Amino acid sequence: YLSKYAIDMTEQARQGKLDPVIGREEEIRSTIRVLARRIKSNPCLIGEPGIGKTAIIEGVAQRIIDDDVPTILQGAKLFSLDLAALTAGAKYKGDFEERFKGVLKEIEESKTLIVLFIDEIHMLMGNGKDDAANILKPALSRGQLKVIGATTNNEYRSIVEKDGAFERRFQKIEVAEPSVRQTVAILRGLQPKYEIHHGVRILDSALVTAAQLAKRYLPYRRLPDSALDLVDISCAGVAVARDSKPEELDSKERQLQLIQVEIKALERDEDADSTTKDRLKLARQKEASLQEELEPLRQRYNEEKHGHEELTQAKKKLDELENKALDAERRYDTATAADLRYFAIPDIKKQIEKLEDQVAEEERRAGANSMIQNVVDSDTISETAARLTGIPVKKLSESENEKLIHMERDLSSEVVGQMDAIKAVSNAVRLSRSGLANPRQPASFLFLGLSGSGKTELAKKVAGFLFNDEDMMIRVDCSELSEKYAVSKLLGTTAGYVGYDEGGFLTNQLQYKPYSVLLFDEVEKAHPDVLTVMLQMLDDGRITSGQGKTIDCSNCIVIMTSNLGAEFINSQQGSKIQESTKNLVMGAVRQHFRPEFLNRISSIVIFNKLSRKAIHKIVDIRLKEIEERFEQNDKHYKLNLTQEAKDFLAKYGYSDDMGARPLNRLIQNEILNKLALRILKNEIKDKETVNVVLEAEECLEVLPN
Amino acid sequence: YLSKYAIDMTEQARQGKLDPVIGREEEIRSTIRVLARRIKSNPCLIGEPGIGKTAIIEGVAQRIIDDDVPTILQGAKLFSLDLAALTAGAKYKGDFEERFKGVLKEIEESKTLIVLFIDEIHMLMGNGKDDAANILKPALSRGQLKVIGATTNNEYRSIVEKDGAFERRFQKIEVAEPSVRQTVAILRGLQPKYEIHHGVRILDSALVTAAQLAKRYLPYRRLPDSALDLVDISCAGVAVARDSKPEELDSKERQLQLIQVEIKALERDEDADSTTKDRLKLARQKEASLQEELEPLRQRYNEEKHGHEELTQAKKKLDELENKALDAERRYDTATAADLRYFAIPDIKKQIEKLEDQVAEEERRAGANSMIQNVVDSDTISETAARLTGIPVKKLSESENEKLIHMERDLSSEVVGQMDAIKAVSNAVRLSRSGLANPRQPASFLFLGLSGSGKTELAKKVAGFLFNDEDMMIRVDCSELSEKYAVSKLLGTTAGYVGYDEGGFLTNQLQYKPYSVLLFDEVEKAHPDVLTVMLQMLDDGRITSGQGKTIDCSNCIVIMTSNLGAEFINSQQGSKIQESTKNLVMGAVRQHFRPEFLNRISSIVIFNKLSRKAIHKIVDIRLKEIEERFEQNDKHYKLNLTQEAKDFLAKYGYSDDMGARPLNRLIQNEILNKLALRILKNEIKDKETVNVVLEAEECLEVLPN
Ligand SMILES: Nc1ncnc2c1ncn2[C@@H]1O[C@H](COP(=O)(O)OP(=O)(O)O)[C@@H](O)[C@H]1O
Ligand SMILES: Nc1ncnc2c1ncn2[C@@H]1O[C@H](COP(=O)(O)OP(=O)(O)O)[C@@H](O)[C@H]1O
Ligand SMILES: Nc1ncnc2c1ncn2[C@@H]1O[C@H](COP(=O)(O)OP(=O)(O)O)[C@@H](O)[C@H]1O
Ligand SMILES: Nc1ncnc2c1ncn2[C@@H]1O[C@H](COP(=O)(O)OP(=O)(O)O)[C@@H](O)[C@H]1O
């Protein structure tokens, strides 16, 4: 029977068993217009699967119930036919086929216009036709059977390369991820569902931050989903908080126990006549005192709890009344709609407001009540995210804009000098955003000046501030870009060719890190073909993967690096790269890259010869970096390098061969080895001081012990 | 019929029998949070076999027991439904299905929210899915039918990838292995259960050491359970060792009984009256003397045992009274709580205090009388470990610091030559072990140098030293790691391809050895991709399979050997390698590997030519080794190596083309073979100790008689 597994979605939705659908109307209308088409009556939802898409289909079911359809579809009924219909519904080979033909024939059989839909449209045609109604359904569609399908970009793209008839039969509609703003409106629409689900209110701001954070920190998941995860999760987290009632009750009740236990113990003994044991009477006074606290505590918890329960039920009833009104209105049973629309629905609205007054959010806190409700925009959602993303509130709390005026400073704290570079970079980061640059034109730079200048480290630190994650960066070995430029290429292995490794670095990492910075290590050595795909990446960087052939590029900040101007930089005797010298570098830039590439870069930036005066500061930054993390602070050298270690390190550090790079071999192989030893030998146990105990570099720093 | 189909975990918790665990409170709150979630309502505990998933859920049930569960779930009941419930009832296809549906109907209607727990998600779906719940279950989710699942990280990924359905209703909860510290706390929590079962009290420090030992020596076993395995096993060890009541007694009772029988046999005999047999009277004095010691041992053990059992029961009873009293207080039934708190509880608590005082404890032991059977923290655990892992004495003598302190010395006593290297390596290891180094990256170094000169032998000795086991090393033939790198790459084959020994050579061995030494033989010849893969999982040692399973052995010391510097080694510029020849080598290193590789290695060693000075001595050392290897006391040669053997061997030994390598052959070819001949003659009973007496290499040793 069709009744097995096929779900009458219009009946389901009619019964109020369908969530309201918000902000999809254009896609829904498109779907309906397709169903209306006399020939190509079969729409298909395409795009990114985390977006769900199904709500659109369900939106159609709702339109059918309410008949907000073209009337040629007035008699339509919409059914969900999927998975279990062919899988759980089958025991032996061939049952699969019968579930199709059996049901589908019943679908044709007389009972008005039936539209079916399959959310995994890909289940049909299997992985290579096998008549998983691959032919049958089309045959049946000749016989009216209108079908709504849903798929993914990966799926139909493979389908049309194996078939193509599907495409000829289907009107693909891509489902767009809603903007955060749209998402919030959506969340508001769904807000009472979640409030009901958990017995909590949700701060409107929380709806906002859920969308913002879902988007900002969990972008790998499509926003409608991710946002709702923050909502239902955070709401549940609050529901868990709503069961913290016992923490106060048990504190007092456990104290009653200790007292009740002592009272009998105290009641009879050799010393019963002494004030030592007669304290029993005081124990009873304390047992009573705790009861005095427990009475208003328990009463408060229950009064407030009831206010939340009543609020919740009022919201449930408002929604049930509206569901019924909507049914009655299309039925033209407006008298019964009136029973809901007049007085009842608005009265419940007013009951809800009064019940929120019982919840009593007050100037004292987010709910005067002890239930703890009101998902908090900041702390609740943020911590929810912390549970999902990790990293502390700083990550989760920013004005954003402010980074331009703080991050450039903090960056100068992380790396020494290069302030002009820092400003240039910082500027593109916040200004490309606030400047509303084409969103597919993320900040991008070419980092010139030489290795050892920290230009790379800057970018790393920038990732730090941009994403609260230095390891957000995607590094690309551009020197490993020979004529083969295959898997390692931004595109990776071409679809259908051997090797499923695609987008060597780019897909492979952006798919996990959509918000990221990418860095091209010695980009100057890249094969021109790569430089060409990079050109694309630098502007409208819509890079298509090797196998999937999908694109996901936006906030993909790009830093390219080179030692391209080295002779010019070597010539420079000062710090700030001199005029003309910089032009010599530009000459070389133009030799290596075409203007069409270069013009896409937010800025070409040449890093300065920071020299001694800078490394003199770098050594403190590095030194404290090491100790600041350490393990646990049960040590703490004064970190008093003094000019001895600072300068010996600088001399042993800032080599023109690699600038400051040796610094991180220094320390390690000069003192850290000793720290470990002296500490593990139990010579050194806490604190300590830094100084130098005086062949090349033979003093080797050597700290006090 | 549910009781046929599943175990009421919650009721069992009411009945106890579910040992409580700690350290999973967040997992539990999360489980609950998910269960509270109304959309993705079903949690899964994902981790490792033995990760904690079972107890976590039983802990969840405990939250139900004590009303620490939100109103949504508060009245819920938890059942364990698995294996027997899934397949034992199968006689034909159909039991599972009807049994399954039966359950779902019973847990859904009327009888609150009965929640199911699937202990093994593996059993769901299974090999081919077969609607083993997985299809109808979520289809039926409209009935809530709340369920908790659990599996491993690896299996989890494969089921999600195959599914895309339960995924949409479930919330993954990752379960971390508890730290050693956490584990110990847990061990303490369960210690009584062991002490109770076994009749073996255990010194607290045992638990401390057990967790340490478990992590350290029971490679693939997880702490919350494997530590217990050491406990359970060692408890049993003691339980067995004590045999007849405590240790000491058993052995003396065995003497007593052997004596008792002898005496009685002597008492009635042909010559019983002769001093030949009448000596039984003195044997009787021994029987009696033993009896006089044995009785106190028995009595101390037994009376204390009685107290031990009384403590066992008293503590159980204490918990029962509090559990019931809590039920009473959460219901506000102060009368019942009082009945279970006044007298009830003072009685049990005082029994416990009195009993513990009667048992009493000493600094030497957690039981002043006998019910400890002299169990000793590390000694008895270590011996347990020795039985499980071997190397008794060095496992006993395992101080981290005795090693770290003398590390380079001890290593130099085994390895002779570039002691500087030994120091360098030692230091790197110290940094790693000390946590001074970034804890994600174990020490590792490039290892160049003259062949046949102990480069890998050092690694063996390091492994020896660090693990008390030369077998701890894993070796990699890097030259075979051409572009082909597949089953042979660390990750192994990409899952989905034929063959699942995915880096078995690498990853699985690494799995078996989570603390280890790994050496790359001719790392310079590895394909750049391989080097990259290694590098990426070299620092931040996230060893990961083709299925995405990470071993993460941040504890592996890695050696990256090659012949890269051979052209400079061949310069023969001294024994200790002349400075600047080393620079040329390092130049070559810098050119043979991308600097990024070199940016992560912790160090580099280029082994010195030993010259005649050292090899003349080294050979003597291996001759010692040969004897050390020998199985019995009929050798123990000094071997008259005088100078002549050292010279013979040196002359025909230390070649630039193979170094000391062929010395085992010289020794074998001439020494062992000549010994074999004489041994064969069997005219040798001990010592041997012979010298060199004589075309090519004419001395040929040739040993005397
Ligand atoms: N504006 C919205 N209003 C209601 N639901 C929405 C809205 N936007 C997205 N959704 C739905 O939330 C659900 C998340 O996807 P879901 O349907 O659960 O997964 P899938 O369709 O892949 O099985 C989808 O139906 C999605 O369409
Ligand atoms: N605080 C700092 N300011 C500027 N540079 C720094 C700072 N700390 C470290 N560095 C240097 O930045 C460099 C990062 O490497 P990089 O310059 O890109 O060299 P390479 O291109 O050889 O990898 C290192 O030389 C590192 O020491
Ligand atoms: N002390 C403990 N801490 C946490 N879990 C424990 C402890 N003792 C036993 N267990 C549980 O037993 C399980 C291992 O045994 P078992 O219950 O059969 O489950 P598993 O399938 O994981 O092996 C662990 O998952 C763990 O939950
Ligand atoms: N001082 C030494 N200590 C230990 N082994 C040494 C020493 N000198 C030479 N050798 C020998 O080098 C041989 C193996 O040399 P090694 O360089 O590690 O191997 P390979 O050349 O096979 O890579 C061993 O027989 C080892 O004893």
Walkthrough of the structure:
This is part of a larger assembly, with two copies of chain A (705 residues). Chain A is 50% helix and 7% strand. Chain A has 27 helices and eleven strands. The first copy, chain A, is flat, with a radius of gyration of 34 Å. In chain A, the strands form two sheets. The first copy, chain A, has a six-stranded mixed β-sheet. In chain A, strands 8-9-10-7-11 form a five-stranded parallel β-sheet. Chain A has four domains: 177 residues, Rossmann fold; 219 residues, Helicase, Ruva Protein, domain 3; 213 residues, Rossmann fold; 96 residues, Helicase, Ruva Protein, domain 3, CATH 1.10.8.60. Chain A starts with 6 loop residues before the first strand and ends in a 25-residue tail after the last helix. With 705 residues, chain A is an alpha/beta fold. In chain A, helix 5 links the parallel strand 4 and strand 5.
The span between the termini of chain A is 85 Å
Total strands of chain A: the figure is: 11
From the spread of the alpha carbons, the general shape of chain A counts as: flat
Write the CATH architecture name of the largest domain in chain A: Orthogonal Bundle
As a percent range, the share of helical residues of chain A equals 40-55%
Query: What share of the residues of chain A does DSSP label as strand, in percent?
Result: 5-15%
Arrangement of strands in the largest sheet of chain A: 1-3-4-5-2-6
CATH class of the largest domain in chain A: Mainly Alpha
Largest interface: A-B, 57 and 64 residues
Bound molecules: adenosine-5'-diphosphate
How many whole angstroms does the radius of gyration of chain A measure? 34 Å
Quaternary state of this entry equals part of a larger assembly
Q: How many domains is the backbone of chain A divided into?
A: 4
Q: What's the helix count of chain A?
A: 27
Binding site for ATP 1 (chains A, B): 47-54
GO molecular function, one term (chains A, B): ATP binding
Keywords (chains A, B): Acetylation, ATP-binding, Chaperone, Coiled coil, Cytoplasm, Isopeptide bond, Nucleotide-binding, Nucleus, Phosphoprotein, Repeat, Stress response, Ubl conjugation
Subcellular location (chains A, B): Cytoplasm; Nucleus
